[PDB]
Amino acid sequence: IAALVIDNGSGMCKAGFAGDDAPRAVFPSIVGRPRHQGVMVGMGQKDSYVGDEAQSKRGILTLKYPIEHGIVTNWDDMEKIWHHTFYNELRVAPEEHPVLLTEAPLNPKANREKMTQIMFETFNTPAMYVAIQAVLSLYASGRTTGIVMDSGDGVTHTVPIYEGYALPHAILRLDLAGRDLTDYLMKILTERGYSFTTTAEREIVRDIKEKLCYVALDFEQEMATAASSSSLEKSYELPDGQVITIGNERFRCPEALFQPSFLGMESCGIHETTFNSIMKCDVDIRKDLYANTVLSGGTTMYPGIADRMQKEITALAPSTMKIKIIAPPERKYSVWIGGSILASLSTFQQMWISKQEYDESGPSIVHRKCF
């Protein structure tokens, strides 16, 4: 039968099948349970609205956001997002198709064992595997060795991978990502005299970011080209009949990644975070990582990101180093594409954990099966 693959990540869940060159369904990771009896009053054998429709009705249905930082947190509300994945959306049964899952970088041994349990104990899966998002975002690009910069809605990470193995002594997590930008962009646009509310009029602002925003190679040159010329300005027509102007706020938004001080944080940006993760490794493997940096994720999808990640890692690094930045255009879904691949491979028939080894060993088999 065919496989089912899911990327429980950050804000949005990418699900579909193996072989598919694209995720069939990409919905949120939100669960919206009731606010007060009176909304349960009503109709339904349904308690919570999960996913795409939770956000539609949410002043009535108060919600939970599980896994917003990559690690699951609510294991009851996550049984739900996997129901809007193989049941009420992406419809075919869990029992019929084998599932590949993607854990966050550095997933706790315990959060792992529940996915193994929830999968066999609640979903009767034939077989299961839990892998790391980043190990699979490199298999998309055809690599088995290198460093990944996975960026989602809420968690960004730098994961070194030496032969399928992300090296835990060097996994670094940034915790600044997609929302932190939209919210900066909201605020830096709220100051331009083009204000937006912080309750759902801010999705219009999530559209200016992906659509009309880029990483600026020299922020400081980029600032000068803005106060002398209207050559860098672009225009947005709001869904509410208002056309606006953007400019400097465009490139100031994806700078939070390179320079995190914009949000008040005292952390270090992706270029620093990448160097520090490469050097938390041995000198023998550092060369194969500098030349193999995969920008994966969707916050890593601003045009120019790999040209600033060349300039910012060429400057931070030794001079004998080749820095190849690989940002395939499908970085938005590279954890996916590579989960589709792993699962469509024919040598993989073995690693899927079987329900026969689940019953014999427990959910403490993920550790001895998944790598």
Binding site: E191, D218, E220, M223, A224, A227, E249
Partner: protein
């Protein structure tokens, strides 16, 4: 207290709420907040004189709603 104006080479006025004692590095810090310009790229010129970072708005007789001026140091390239 007071309000001062700063005009760029595109012709845009940024408005600042300052005091006669605010340093020029304080004004240069308010333009980083409101506009993003690192405060080092900012060069401020009132009176045909580039202003000093350790000096105050009343050491230069900027007062009222005075238009000051801003250029961005193009470096690194």
């Amino acid at each position: 207290s007071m309000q001062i104006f700063v005009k760029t080479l595109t012709g845009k006025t940024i408005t600042l709420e300052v005091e006669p004692s605010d340093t020029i590095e304080n004004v240069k810090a308010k333009i980083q907040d409101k506009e993003g310009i690192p405060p080092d790229q900012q060069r401020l010129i009132f009176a045909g004189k580039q202003l000093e970072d350790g000096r105050t708005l009343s050491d230069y007789n900027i007062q009222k709603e005075s238009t000051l001026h801003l250029v961005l140091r193009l470096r690194g390239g």
